[PDB]
Design an enzyme around this catalytic site. Structure first.
Site, PDB file in Angstrom:
ATOM      1  N   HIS A 188     -32.070   1.372 -22.442  1.00 10.58           N
ATOM      2  CA  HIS A 188     -31.773   2.192 -23.204  1.00 10.58           C
ATOM      3  C   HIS A 188     -32.152   3.126 -24.010  1.00 10.58           C
ATOM      4  O   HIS A 188     -31.813   2.256 -25.626  1.00 10.58           O
ATOM      5  CB  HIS A 188     -30.233   1.719 -23.375  1.00 10.58           C
ATOM      6  CG  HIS A 188     -29.731   1.681 -21.595  1.00 10.58           C
ATOM      7  ND1 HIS A 188     -30.125   0.180 -21.232  1.00 10.58           N
ATOM      8  CD2 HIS A 188     -29.004   2.332 -20.564  1.00 10.58           C
ATOM      9  CE1 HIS A 188     -28.940   0.612 -20.198  1.00 10.58           C
ATOM     10  NE2 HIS A 188     -28.111   1.826 -19.676  1.00 10.58           N
ATOM     11  N   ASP A 247     -36.130   2.935 -12.472  1.00  9.29           N
ATOM     12  CA  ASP A 247     -34.993   2.520 -12.661  1.00  9.29           C
ATOM     13  C   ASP A 247     -33.905   3.022 -12.058  1.00  9.29           C
ATOM     14  O   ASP A 247     -33.693   4.191 -11.951  1.00  9.29           O
ATOM     15  CB  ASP A 247     -34.087   2.597 -14.058  1.00  9.29           C
ATOM     16  CG  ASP A 247     -32.425   2.364 -13.805  1.00  9.29           C
ATOM     17  OD1 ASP A 247     -32.461   1.611 -13.192  1.00  9.29           O
ATOM     18  OD2 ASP A 247     -31.395   2.459 -15.035  1.00  9.29           O
ATOM     19  N   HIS A 278     -29.487   7.581 -18.922  1.00  3.60           N
ATOM     20  CA  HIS A 278     -29.633   7.113 -19.796  1.00  3.60           C
ATOM     21  C   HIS A 278     -31.592   7.808 -20.224  1.00  3.60           C
ATOM     22  O   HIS A 278     -32.183   7.243 -18.778  1.00  3.60           O
ATOM     23  CB  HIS A 278     -29.539   5.650 -20.336  1.00  3.60           C
ATOM     24  CG  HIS A 278     -30.061   4.896 -19.406  1.00  3.60           C
ATOM     25  ND1 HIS A 278     -31.490   4.254 -19.403  1.00  3.60           N
ATOM     26  CD2 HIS A 278     -29.607   4.247 -17.921  1.00  3.60           C
ATOM     27  CE1 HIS A 278     -32.104   3.658 -17.941  1.00  3.60           C
ATOM     28  NE2 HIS A 278     -30.420   3.814 -17.360  1.00  3.60           N
ATOM     29  N   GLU A 333     -28.062   9.047 -13.626  1.00  4.26           N
ATOM     30  CA  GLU A 333     -26.864   7.263 -12.719  1.00  4.26           C
ATOM     31  C   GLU A 333     -25.556   7.760 -12.438  1.00  4.26           C
ATOM     32  O   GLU A 333     -24.504   7.613 -12.974  1.00  4.26           O
ATOM     33  CB  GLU A 333     -26.669   5.959 -13.031  1.00  4.26           C
ATOM     34  CG  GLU A 333     -27.633   5.398 -13.639  1.00  4.26           C
ATOM     35  CD  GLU A 333     -27.129   4.201 -14.186  1.00  4.26           C
ATOM     36  OE1 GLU A 333     -26.955   3.338 -13.371  1.00  4.26           O
ATOM     37  OE2 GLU A 333     -27.609   3.815 -15.429  1.00  4.26           O
ATOM     38  N   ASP A 347     -28.566  -1.707  -7.578  1.00  3.33           N
ATOM     39  CA  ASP A 347     -29.764  -1.391  -8.490  1.00  3.33           C
ATOM     40  C   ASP A 347     -30.816  -1.856  -9.121  1.00  3.33           C
ATOM     41  O   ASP A 347     -30.374  -3.187  -9.365  1.00  3.33           O
ATOM     42  CB  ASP A 347     -28.808  -0.894 -10.026  1.00  3.33           C
ATOM     43  CG  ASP A 347     -28.740  -0.023 -10.767  1.00  3.33           C
ATOM     44  OD1 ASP A 347     -27.900   0.669 -11.633  1.00  3.33           O
ATOM     45  OD2 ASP A 347     -30.056   0.026 -11.194  1.00  3.33           O
ATOM     46  N   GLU A 384     -29.121   6.847  -8.214  1.00  2.00           N
ATOM     47  CA  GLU A 384     -29.433   6.766  -9.268  1.00  2.00           C
ATOM     48  C   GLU A 384     -31.188   6.791  -8.935  1.00  2.00           C
ATOM     49  O   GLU A 384     -31.721   5.857  -8.190  1.00  2.00           O
ATOM     50  CB  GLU A 384     -29.543   5.532 -10.040  1.00  2.00           C
ATOM     51  CG  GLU A 384     -30.583   5.078 -10.943  1.00  2.00           C
ATOM     52  CD  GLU A 384     -30.270   3.936 -12.036  1.00  2.00           C
ATOM     53  OE1 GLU A 384     -29.950   3.247 -11.749  1.00  2.00           O
ATOM     54  OE2 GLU A 384     -30.008   3.983 -13.760  1.00  2.00           O
TER      55      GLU A 384
END
Ligand SMILES: [Co+2]
Ligand SMILES: [Co+2]
Ligand SMILES: [Co+2]
Ligand SMILES: [Co+2]
Ligand SMILES: [Co+2]
Ligand SMILES: [Co+2]
Lengths: 301, 301
Positions: free
Chosen positions: A161, A93, A153, A187, A82, A280
């Site tokens: 977040h 992300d 998120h 995710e 990640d 993700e």
């Protein structure tokens, strides 16, 4: 601008992610991997949005190496890479699961297809509950279980977040409608265990919360350091290991935790020790055909 | 005023809630109970924030009587009474579980204690994850399971579900920080079943969601009525059974749903048909939160 910086962070995240996958082979020391990745990020003009996470098997997330960590990749290991990159606060992300030295299996495909199905329905005007339904359906239809306390998120400038999340299960009241311009990370987390993660030692990641009074000097100054160096973005215990003696560092962080100045984010493992898979992508919500910042770049580099 | 109207809504919700409990006796027709409650709300000067829900046993929520519904309360029934009231858009949302003709048992106690535990830690500056933590631990500690896809929610003017939720389980990333002025409903759901709900027929509750063009005259007029009398707050199929024949009403509602003007909310039940207990209060965040759905309190510090 906004979009441009974001796409740029996406481009870097993509290159960095591919390299990591290529370096994730049997015998590879986790610490070296994490270092190489974070190094590549800076040399490419970006800054880490958070420490590179490298979670193996039942460990779902929040694991980043530390100086002295002897852990190495083993064949068959389910490695979740990640990585996050930001440019002036605009965060990209992304994550992938790689089965070390092997091809993707059914469990990994479940998470990856869950992500594809979520992006397929994710567009301006759609309610989040629709993504959860699509995600839950792909995972359970394939015989696996989604993790109920870990998910996507909303992302905002200098805020990993933003508050609103994208569950991996259908929740009847997730009536929040995606708006164009909205930045979300989707995710899907799939496991063979129960479908829930728990916190376990050690704590390798922390995040600044509030500027509360701290009587202990060493802890008080560590907070002032954290606040200006990392701001509201997650940081690794590893990033501070050369700043002060391990012993003192561990106690200073603990003080800030109990004081409520910072939050500790310990290792998250599946409750029944079930293998976990994750995929993700970060996307920009747009009137149909949302942009996947971490796909092939399709907005404004 | 702002907080004045909110408090008033809670005052009414509280009185109506306590009255519904007294009326929840063996043999009581659900349709009668709902009618009496909603009538009491209006004569008290308020308006239903949504149709009074009366959900028995494995039925977790989203069940409200309808014209022709002959369902009656049976002794030993786990009835969850969820009532809502608003004063010019300011909503009060509360709920309690009562074991018809009997006293509180283990399951019910867990849900109630979970709610008190969340309220206790609820204050400005606290992350929502802390509420989920306290809720889950109270339910788990007593040997029960919290429902993972049904929980609390932020409340705004003419907006029952603002977007942000308060899960009944600990989620490491629910980093939303409660702030003064925030209005939240804490809604712990406990069960002896698996711990998840699913949508099942019938659909007894709907809600205006978007202002989309509706050509069909009959359905179009019904929409005008909805927007005029219910606005953006949930309404019952029951509240419209006198305006037109069942057949036309059903088709009219289906037409509005197909256009995406309204959304249907079908009954929700425990996936393993496990008994469900629920307790709920609406709070307003401050230096130290205050419960809206209870008698007023002094200054003190
Ligand atoms: Co995380
Ligand atoms: Co990520
Ligand atoms: Co993420
Ligand atoms: Co509801
Ligand atoms: Co309620
Ligand atoms: Co509620």
């Amino acid at each position: 601008m906004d979009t441009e910086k974001l796409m740029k962070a996406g481009e870097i995240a993509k290159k960095v992610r591919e390299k990591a996958i290529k370096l994730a082979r049997p015998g590879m020391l986790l610490l070296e991997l994490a270092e190489s990745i974070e190094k590549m990020i800076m040399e490419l003009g970006g800054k880490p949005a958070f420490p590179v996470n490298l979670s193996i098997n039942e460990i779902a997330a929040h694991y980043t190496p530390y100086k002295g960590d002897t852990t190495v990749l083993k064949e068959g290991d389910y490695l979740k890479i990640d990585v996050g990159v930001h440019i002036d606060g605009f965060i990209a992300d992304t994550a992938v699961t790689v089965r070390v030295g092997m091809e993707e299996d059914e469990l990994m495909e479940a998470a990856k297809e869950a992500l594809n199905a979520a992006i397929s329905v994710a567009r301006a005007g759609v309610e989040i509950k629709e993504l959860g339904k699509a995600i839950e359906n792909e995972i359970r239809k394939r015989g696996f279980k989604p993790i109920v306390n870990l998910s996507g998120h909303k992302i905002e400038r200098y805020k990993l977040h933003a508050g609103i999340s994208i569950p991996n299960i259908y929740r009847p009241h997730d009536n929040y409608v995606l708006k164009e311009g909205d930045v979300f990370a989707i995710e899907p987390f799939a496991t063979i265990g129960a479908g829930q993660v728990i916190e376990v030692p050690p704590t390798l990641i922390y995040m600044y919360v509030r500027d509360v009074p701290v009587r202990v000097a060493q802890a008080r100054f560590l907070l002032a350091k954290i606040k200006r160096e990392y701001g509201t973005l997650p940081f690794a215990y590893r990033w501070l290991q050369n700043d002060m003696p391990e012993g003192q560092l561990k106690l200073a962080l603990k003080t800030l935790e109990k004081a409520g100045a910072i939050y500790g984010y310990p290792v998250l493992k599946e409750i029944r020790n079930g293998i976990v898979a994750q995929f993700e992508h970060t996307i920009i919500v747009e009137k149909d055909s949302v942009i996947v910042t971490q796909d092939m770049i399709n907005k404004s580099t």
